[PDB]
Enzyme design. Structure first.
Site, mmCIF file in Angstrom:
data_model
loop_
_atom_site.group_PDB
_atom_site.id
_atom_site.type_symbol
_atom_site.label_atom_id
_atom_site.label_comp_id
_atom_site.label_asym_id
_atom_site.label_seq_id
_atom_site.Cartn_x
_atom_site.Cartn_y
_atom_site.Cartn_z
ATOM 1 N N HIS A 1 37.019 -49.536 146.465
ATOM 2 C CA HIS A 1 36.511 -49.698 147.822
ATOM 3 C C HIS A 1 35.761 -48.591 148.548
ATOM 4 O O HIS A 1 35.712 -48.562 149.781
ATOM 5 C CB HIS A 1 37.521 -50.377 148.742
ATOM 6 C CG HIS A 1 36.883 -51.328 149.705
ATOM 7 N ND1 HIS A 1 36.090 -50.944 150.761
ATOM 8 C CD2 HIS A 1 36.882 -52.684 149.724
ATOM 9 C CE1 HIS A 1 35.643 -52.048 151.371
ATOM 10 N NE2 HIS A 1 36.099 -53.132 150.777
ATOM 11 N N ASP B 1 48.366 -36.930 125.532
ATOM 12 C CA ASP B 1 49.387 -36.680 126.539
ATOM 13 C C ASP B 1 49.772 -38.022 127.150
ATOM 14 O O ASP B 1 48.976 -38.645 127.856
ATOM 15 C CB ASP B 1 48.831 -35.745 127.624
ATOM 16 C CG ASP B 1 49.778 -35.557 128.821
ATOM 17 O OD1 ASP B 1 49.383 -34.829 129.751
ATOM 18 O OD2 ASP B 1 50.898 -36.115 128.857
ATOM 19 N N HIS C 1 41.668 -33.025 118.708
ATOM 20 C CA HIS C 1 42.149 -33.885 119.777
ATOM 21 C C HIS C 1 43.661 -34.012 119.692
ATOM 22 O O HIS C 1 44.263 -33.732 118.656
ATOM 23 C CB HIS C 1 41.528 -35.281 119.674
ATOM 24 C CG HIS C 1 40.036 -35.282 119.606
ATOM 25 N ND1 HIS C 1 39.260 -35.194 120.734
ATOM 26 C CD2 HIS C 1 39.229 -35.389 118.516
ATOM 27 C CE1 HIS C 1 38.010 -35.248 120.318
ATOM 28 N NE2 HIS C 1 37.942 -35.367 118.982
ATOM 29 N N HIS D 1 51.777 -39.854 129.786
ATOM 30 C CA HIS D 1 52.461 -39.572 131.044
ATOM 31 C C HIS D 1 53.844 -40.217 131.067
ATOM 32 O O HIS D 1 54.712 -39.813 131.841
ATOM 33 C CB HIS D 1 51.636 -40.040 132.246
ATOM 34 C CG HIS D 1 50.507 -39.122 132.595
ATOM 35 N ND1 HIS D 1 49.702 -39.275 133.704
ATOM 36 C CD2 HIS D 1 50.050 -38.016 131.962
ATOM 37 C CE1 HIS D 1 48.806 -38.281 133.702
ATOM 38 N NE2 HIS D 1 48.977 -37.488 132.664
ATOM 39 N N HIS E 1 37.334 -33.492 127.887
ATOM 40 C CA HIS E 1 37.689 -34.609 127.017
ATOM 41 C C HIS E 1 37.997 -35.863 127.824
ATOM 42 O O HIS E 1 37.573 -36.964 127.465
ATOM 43 C CB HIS E 1 38.885 -34.255 126.128
ATOM 44 C CG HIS E 1 38.526 -33.411 124.947
ATOM 45 N ND1 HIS E 1 38.849 -33.793 123.666
ATOM 46 C CD2 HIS E 1 37.824 -32.252 124.903
ATOM 47 C CE1 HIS E 1 38.336 -32.868 122.878
ATOM 48 N NE2 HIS E 1 37.706 -31.914 123.580
ATOM 49 N N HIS F 1 46.056 -39.491 127.920
ATOM 50 C CA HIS F 1 44.725 -38.918 127.737
ATOM 51 C C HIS F 1 44.759 -37.729 126.799
ATOM 52 O O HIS F 1 45.822 -37.161 126.547
ATOM 53 C CB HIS F 1 44.149 -38.475 129.090
ATOM 54 C CG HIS F 1 44.975 -37.436 129.791
ATOM 55 N ND1 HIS F 1 44.881 -36.083 129.550
ATOM 56 C CD2 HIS F 1 45.929 -37.574 130.748
ATOM 57 C CE1 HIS F 1 45.756 -35.455 130.351
ATOM 58 N NE2 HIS F 1 46.418 -36.318 131.097
ATOM 59 N N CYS F 2 43.598 -37.365 126.270
ATOM 60 C CA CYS F 2 43.513 -36.215 125.384
ATOM 61 C C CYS F 2 43.589 -34.972 126.265
ATOM 62 O O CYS F 2 43.163 -34.995 127.423
ATOM 63 C CB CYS F 2 42.198 -36.224 124.608
ATOM 64 S SG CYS F 2 42.005 -34.835 123.442
ATOM 65 N N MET G 1 38.116 -40.034 127.047
ATOM 66 C CA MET G 1 39.328 -39.977 126.239
ATOM 67 C C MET G 1 40.622 -40.133 127.033
ATOM 68 O O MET G 1 41.412 -39.192 127.178
ATOM 69 C CB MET G 1 39.352 -38.718 125.372
ATOM 70 C CG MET G 1 40.086 -38.953 124.067
ATOM 71 S SD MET G 1 39.695 -37.797 122.760
ATOM 72 C CE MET G 1 40.971 -38.204 121.611
ATOM 73 N N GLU H 1 45.286 -55.163 151.101
ATOM 74 C CA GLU H 1 43.867 -55.469 151.166
ATOM 75 C C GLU H 1 43.194 -54.507 150.195
ATOM 76 O O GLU H 1 42.413 -54.921 149.340
ATOM 77 C CB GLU H 1 43.312 -55.301 152.589
ATOM 78 C CG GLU H 1 43.310 -53.880 153.138
ATOM 79 C CD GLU H 1 42.765 -53.790 154.552
ATOM 80 O OE1 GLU H 1 41.647 -54.284 154.806
ATOM 81 O OE2 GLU H 1 43.454 -53.210 155.413
ATOM 82 N N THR H 2 43.577 -53.235 150.278
ATOM 83 C CA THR H 2 43.027 -52.193 149.420
ATOM 84 C C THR H 2 44.134 -51.185 149.121
ATOM 85 O O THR H 2 44.751 -50.639 150.038
ATOM 86 C CB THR H 2 41.847 -51.484 150.116
ATOM 87 O OG1 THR H 2 40.849 -52.453 150.450
ATOM 88 C CG2 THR H 2 41.225 -50.434 149.208
ATOM 89 N N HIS I 1 40.223 -53.019 145.126
ATOM 90 C CA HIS I 1 40.153 -54.079 146.122
ATOM 91 C C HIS I 1 39.517 -55.314 145.500
ATOM 92 O O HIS I 1 38.450 -55.231 144.893
ATOM 93 C CB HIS I 1 39.322 -53.631 147.338
ATOM 94 C CG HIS I 1 39.167 -54.687 148.394
ATOM 95 N ND1 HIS I 1 39.946 -54.722 149.530
ATOM 96 C CD2 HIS I 1 38.343 -55.759 148.477
ATOM 97 C CE1 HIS I 1 39.615 -55.770 150.263
ATOM 98 N NE2 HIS I 1 38.645 -56.416 149.645
HETATM 99 CU CU LIG Z 1 39.995 -35.226 122.681
HETATM 100 CU CU LIG Z 2 47.721 -35.964 132.557
HETATM 101 CU CU LIG Z 3 35.550 -54.772 151.852
#
Ligand SMILES: [Cu+2]
Ligand SMILES: [Cu+2]
Ligand SMILES: [Cu+2]
Ligand SMILES: [Cu+2]
Ligand SMILES: [Cu+2]
Ligand SMILES: [Cu+2]
Lengths: 331, 331, 331
Positions: free
Chosen positions: C298, C90, C87, C92, C137, C127-128, C142, C271-272, C247
């Site tokens: 939603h 990463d 493993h 971001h 993964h 994430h892995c 992960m 709202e969303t 939402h």
């Molecule tokens: Cu992994």
């Molecule tokens: Cu990524």
């Molecule tokens: Cu709704």
């Protein structure tokens, strides 16, 4: 509150909108609306495909209710004894009780009156949400939207006023119609009979139909929306359960409140905008060229294969500066 | 317009962009382009899967055309007698006649010349849209994009000028290749032969392949895009039919015109942006670290299983202040 | 860097976040974290469906690491001997070596320490990403997120300070669980035995479960999130592989950093909102009404059929001005 003016408004079926003023006339008021819920079979395509629709005010989508910020929306929802299901309403524009859904649960033969202060400006989705069966009622056409206009009407990024000459409400619906082993769409006696098969189709997350105003081609041909060169049009669009990406073929979205919220500055010169499921959006555009336009969900498969396509018939004079055929299709 | 200077531009295959100036050199001009439509078989993966591509200028996606705001793009589209289908072009940047599609319908053996005023600045999608066969042509790779640069070049939200050193055009395509009963992708001796089978796959709304520049791994190795620490790069991205969420693994999108429209302020410090189907976007980024980068559609399944992954080989010195292995992988 | 103060932080399991300050405590420091990778069988629903999860700090999603802009996040990642796979991670938020992935590849029995400068403010997904097994993964749980708060805390798009009273981290996970010929989800002895079948499901781009905090209903009942009328809550939401549209049913997203980046002005009165796969977002909201709230994705099918629904128990007094039942459900 008690001393505020009460005003009853007569609704009109989409894509048309009821009488209203962009800029608020007078002080805050309790705008009263009344909608009767209708459970009825509707045909959604040229192949006679039926759907047991659950519609607010008898239409898919429900009518557009327009009020101004800080006004109160008092809705009287009626569920006739002839219906077989309990319904309620969730106003995304409202605050509290799950948008009002927890205060409006009415069985067949019941009505209810809900009031809420439209504290936020923008286009908002509203839909039926009976606990346990939310997706079903919504994807059965039981949704619509309301527009909470700012007291001072619309404005662009730098406070300059934007006034539309026309406004259209395009409600997009994703349908999940079951099919038998032979690939033919199934028909059921009562709404409940389709539940199980419908849920299996819903879980694929792949709608069988994606339509505007309740049916394939509902907004095409003689039912195409109209405009004229120089005319400013506001196109409110909504999708209560699935994403969409509106696009005016041959045109643009000069000002687009993609999120639907008026306090959020609109994007400009948009080619194709995005409206997430469970939200509404509004695009402002001034037509420059005459002819026919195609307003679609820009996933062309959903648009031309699934039915998410509409038309605009625009009158006026052609502008050769903007576009011209130097050499017409020739050998 | 007739008195306006004219300039014939030489197109280049993506991800490269033809010669141009970020800041307009002179007043409005009629920028001429010419593209020949080529229907050809393309192999999209190392398994030999073929697609009957309908490519503008012979490539999928079509070449990126660059002009400035208020310039006139005059395109001479040619459909050789060697083709079997009628084609046209819809410029989302254009206004009128379905983006030009209504004035450019040419059958094999025909040509046409369309001219339009690029009134709105930004990156716009362009694609074929034959009435009744729209999505099919688009998912057959018949789409691309153009960039209408502002007269004064690019700028950030605060007006500061953003000048790039390099520019790349990544056209993402969603293919729907039919498979026989054994799961093996089918091959056809003609485009029309695949039509029926392709439509069925299209309706599932699940692409068999999602690729950059026409094939899996197209933009890797010999075709990996290059950069150098300190270089400013503009990555134009388009998807004419389906949503995408670009992401530079190991980097970011310092400035991202997510809607692709330059008059709509760019988002900043983006990790992953979103470009709806039927649109194009642009990301400006200054490389800080050397090595290989993976530019992907961040639905890792689409990126690493479906083929939507590209690479960047960056030269330069490593910056230990930004990142450093305090303790390399050990016991 | 070595002269900078260092602070070891104890991580807490989602949806909770470890103690921290919104406004930075003094100058830049090296914030230390430690996470042990655990390959474990987890149940994702009431039926008992199990998944061979790959979890950072043993939880799905991984814990939220909180630091300030220009701080140095130094993570000690440990891969136990009991594990069977290699493993890496990463970030971001990091710049270089594929977000750190290329410098943290550790096999079972190995550990590593990575340090990167948190140069950009906002919430980021981590994430892995083992080369060749990236999506597998990630969809196995992960992934998680980090929050790089501005050194001066949060502020709206106009500079006005936004200080939250509470903060929750909702990690959304899309699972692809194989089923047998009877539609029943399959169970495997070892995670390896699941790979092939899982990949098949992944290719459909249709998750069998879309859950919050590792399981259906994980954030409901006694595990429901809490708040009170007048309380300002920040909800960090992430999805490392698939799109989502948060939402709060009954509420709104007063200030929403949909892109998750603090230098990008927040949308208001949402709202969303929309968060693309491979990204994180944050919504700020001041509760006005007491009662239960449903925080969902939603796409109601994903929310109530697939499992993407959480709850909020809010104490306080009902506000009849905002909403009231003029007429409760009656004949
Ligand atoms: Cu992994
Ligand atoms: Cu990524
Ligand atoms: Cu709704
Ligand atoms: Cu209902
Ligand atoms: Cu074509
Ligand atoms: Cu188009």
């Amino acid at each position: 509150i008690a001393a505020l003016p009460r005003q009853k408004v007569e609704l009109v079926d989409p894509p048309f909108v009821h009488a209203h003023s962009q800029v608020a006339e007078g002080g805050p008021k309790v705008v009263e609306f009344t909608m009767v819920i209708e459970e009825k079979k509707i045909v959604i395509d040229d192949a006679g495909t039926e759907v047991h629709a659950m519609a607010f005010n008898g239409t898919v989508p429900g009518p557009l209710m327009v009020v101004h910020q800080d006004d109160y929306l008092e809705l009287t929802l009626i569920n006739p004894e002839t219906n077989t299901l309990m319904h309620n309403i969730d106003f995304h524009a409202a605050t509290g009780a799950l948008g009002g859904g927890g205060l409006t649960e009415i069985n067949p033969g019941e009505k209810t009156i809900l009031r809420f202060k439209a504290t936020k400006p923008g286009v908002f989705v509203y839909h039926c949400a009976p606990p346990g069966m939310v997706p079903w009622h919504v994807v059965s056409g039981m949704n619509g939207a309301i527009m909470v206009l700012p007291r001072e009407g619309l404005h662009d990024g730098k406070g300059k006023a934007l006034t539309y000459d026309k406004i259209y409400y395009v409600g997009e619906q994703d349908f999940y119609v079951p099919r038998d082993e032979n690939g033919k769409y199934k028909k059921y006696e009562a709404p409940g009979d389709a539940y199980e098969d419908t849920v299996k189709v819903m879980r694929t997350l792949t709608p069988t139909h994606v339509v505007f105003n309740g049916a394939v081609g509902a907004l095409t041909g003689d039912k195409a929306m109209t405009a004229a060169v120089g005319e400013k049009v506001l196109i409110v669009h909504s999708q209560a359960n699935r994403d969409t990406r509106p696009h005016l073929i041959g045109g643009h979205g000069d000002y687009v409140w993609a999120t639907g919220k008026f306090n959020t500055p609109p994007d400009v010169d948009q080619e194709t905008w995005f409206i997430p499921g469970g939200a509404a959006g509004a695009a402002f555009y001034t037509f420059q060229q005459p002819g026919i336009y195609a307003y679609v969900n820009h996933n062309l498969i959903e648009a031309f294969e699934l039915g998410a396509a509409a038309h605009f018939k625009v009158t006026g004079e052609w502008n050769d500066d903007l576009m011209t055929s130097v050499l017409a299709p020739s050998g």
